[PDB]
């Protein structure tokens, strides 16, 4: 919409200046899911005996 | 080779300088509103 006044006359181009399809995107789900514990978790330590 | 012009060439330059630092403080806010339609459509006016 605006651009023009800012952009063109200082050297800027839009993100998807030349593409033939929309840009895919991600998001956070919320629904919890199980995953192995990362061994850099501040306060949690597990090991085999 | 004459430092006598320092009173003529210089010094008096500060008189016009302080004068120049008066109109510029008014045209700034004037251009902070006359930039939308000015940059849009056409130009010519502000080209001068």
Does residue A6 belong to the interface with chain B, where contact is any CB pair within 8 Å? no
**Whole-number Å distance between alpha carbons of B28 and B30:** 5
Smallest CA-to-CA distance from A2 within B35, B45, B42, B29 is with B35
**Coil, strand or helix at B44:** coil
Which two tokens mark A28?
């956070």
User: Are B31 and B39 within 8 A, CB to CB?
Assistant: no
DSSP assignment of chain A: --GGGTTGGGS---TTSS-SSPPP------S----PPPTT-TT------
User: Are A15 and A25 within 8 A, CB to CB?
Assistant: no
Q: Do B35 and A4 touch (CB under 8 A)?
A: no
Give chain B's radius of gyration (CA, Å). Answer: 18
DSSP assignment of B13-30: HHHHHHHHHHHHHHHHHH
Question: Which residues 6+ apart lie within 8 Å of B39 measured at CB?
Answer: A4, A5
To what resolution in angstroms was this structure determined? 3.6
| CA separation, residue B27 to residues A22, A41, B30, B34 (Å) | 44, 60, 5, 10
| CA separation, residue B37 to residues A47, B12, B20, B43 (Å) | 69, 39, 27, 9
Interface test with chain A among B33, B39, B41, B43, by most A beta carbons within 10 Å = B39
This structure was determined by cryo-EM
């Amino acid at each position: 919409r605006f651009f023009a006044i800012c952009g063109l006359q200082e050297g800027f181009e839009p993100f998807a200046i030349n593409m033939q399809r929309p840009v895919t995107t991600w998001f956070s789900k919320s629904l919890p899911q199980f995953e192995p514990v990362p061994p850099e978790h501040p306060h949690y330590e597990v090991a085999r005996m | 080779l004459l430092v006598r012009d320092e009173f003529s060439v210089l010094c008096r330059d500060l008189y016009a300088l302080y004068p120049l630092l008066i109109r510029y403080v008014d045209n700034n806010r004037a251009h902070w509103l006359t930039e939308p339609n000015a940059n849009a459509e056409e130009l010519f006016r502000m080209v001068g």
